[PDB]
Symmetry: D3
């Protein structure tokens, strides 16, 4: 019912944890339709130790990962709403990834904004597409299909 979520609510919905929880705040959310979130990029992240020495560049694949989590938050809330209890036993598997294009490198100090739209969704299978943006510009484009499942 809300459209603005902070790190606290994100931890209660997504199963991801450090160092793979790549969504910091949800700024906009329209159930079954779109979501806008963002992750701040800082030099104080471990992934920078090796990507790359003396040249910090946020991995392209982790940007895709960040987008998937945004969509995963959109998918869970659209299904069961904000129910951490239900969410606490679910995980999220990647099914496919297509048409991803990287236009501008993301670096420390960047506010990487995730913009996801629901292209199609069936039960637990959600297919989203959108872009990663920094200062209003598209730094990345991507389409992906993820499935949420109950931890067996």
């Amino acid at each position: 019912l809300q459209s603005q979520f902070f790190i606290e609510h994100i931890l209660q919905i997504l199963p991801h944890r450090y160092p793979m929880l790549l969504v910091d705040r949800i700024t906009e959310l329209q159930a079954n339709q779109k979501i806008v979130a963002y992750k701040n990029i800082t030099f104080n992240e471990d992934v920078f130790n090796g990507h790359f020495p003396n040249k910090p560049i946020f991995p392209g694949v982790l940007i895709v990962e960040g987008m998937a989590q945004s969509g995963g938050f959109l998918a869970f809330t659209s299904l069961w709403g904000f129910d951490p209890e239900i969410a606490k036993t679910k995980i999220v598997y990647f099914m496919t990834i297509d048409k991803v294009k990287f236009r501008i490198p993301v670096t420390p100090g960047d506010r990487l904004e995730y913009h996801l739209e629901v292209l199609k969704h069936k039960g637990m299978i959600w297919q989203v597409g959108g872009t990663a943006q920094v200062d209003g510009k598209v730094v990345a484009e991507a389409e992906l299909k993820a499935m949420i499942a109950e931890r067996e």
Copy 2:
């Protein structure tokens, strides 16, 4: 075969983003077969996911990109540690990836990449990731080598 110390002399990637442990097969301007061991003792598992260790699909793709990278560096300048150290690799595009089987601690993740097309510093490769002969994922990507 090229072992970890050779890989270090070519790829610019370091911990914790160096996801290729050994190169078992290489054919210039053609293909490459390499792999990375998966063990619980990897930091990514603390968060992906707690109680349910699953190697991230995106990192599977990253491992293939790196395998592709080694293939490009060596095809471009051969095994030249000197040239390599001035470069880094940028992901340009990723397409047609599909995950069929989850990778978990104890798995030997094999990368199979063939050159689909290349020009200058821009290389496009495609293939699969395998575990015990079984295809756990396929993908296509285009990377760029630069200064």
Copy 3:
């Protein structure tokens, strides 16, 4: 210059992971003031234990981030963007005073450091200012440092 990105910052401060808390410098006035910032994201080790389920960027690290900004300020003022000389210097902080924390800092915040030169006499520099998140002051502090030869 007036805008230094992470690479420029890396060539001036000796600080490295996980103690380099200045991601970018948005403005610098030799001998006057500096405005920089560090993004705060959940993907930082410190949040693992401060605290579980309640990510709150440590106040001591805000102050530290403020000290680093002042250090870049004092140094650039004296020698400008000079990587070679930076390697032979040391910015050792002697005191911290009047520190106030008004509102907590959390993942998703852009922690802006605002520091100015309160006093400069020889090797001793005294800076002061605030850390701000979206125009609102979240913390303040006065710090004194001494410039010196590395060893």
Copy 4:
């Protein structure tokens, strides 16, 4: 109320965890009055990776953090004694820091002794002040005011 607490007791009272729990043991404790504790400094701490390369130096701001935590243990035990139950529902916020002076650099192999006395205390607000020592000499001095708040 004890006066000799170990890491096991400390884990049960303070909310801090790795890599921010900077107190290893409590040696002396006088409810509402003073406390003596310490943190061993070893090269095997991640913080030394970047502070600094080739020459390890425990950060001063972190020494102040350790004194604050010592103070917190005193406050908690002062208000509820050793009660892990009510202690789990809390966290400690830094309110102010004053008169901190750094006299001697702290390094790997040092036994950082935290010396703190209560300057003032009302309810959840505790104002403490003292020194951090190593082998009997004062390496740092500081005053701080913390607050214990419901993890609401």
Copy 5:
């Protein structure tokens, strides 16, 4: 019985990252022997300092992994795959003798542990064997474990 994957291992052993050095149990025989392994990959924090520009999995860790396997063997021999009882027991090692290192272990290797029960009396279990990579012996060791009640 049969083979256990990391999941099952997590339910018996109390060890967690970065100290759980057994990824899979491919063979177990009550009161007799165990065959397990840990994959060695460059992506392990340990390789940062052992050593720079020269990754070599520590020998004492090869030994730690043999102990964990041996411990796993003794525990399951008495109680089988019983998670509840596992939280009830403590398996620490009293002794370690006859340790020999023959070949360096590096990223890409599959460190296979081969431990057999030499002798056991009550809760004192003595195991011994080798660490193997590609069928060859990279290390040998004998360890004595004591099984106790947690707390």
Copy 6:
């Protein structure tokens, strides 16, 4: 030639680095005879995260590793003294370990003192033995034979 060394000297002799450099300081050193050194044990170490949760215990094998490093520093200096040049062209690799007995658990707050005596030395082959002590009490004991090898 000296008998007291600090982490800054240790770093110039041993190649070990975080998180495997387990000797913080050397308080005693007698060529070809013995070495007494120590490593502080603090909760702020990665190892404790999983060994074990809610029960920090410094790994016995790590105590042994620490003893081996001291032996290594001893072996090298006995032969070349404090020589950074040569030190970084050689490596002390261990061939065997015997009679290892763990008597008392090591925990955060402990000062793990390493005591190694030279049992036999002939060229590059060194056999040493000793104990790990905490507050004058033996917590561990072991014997090792090391080989000083070329680094290339």
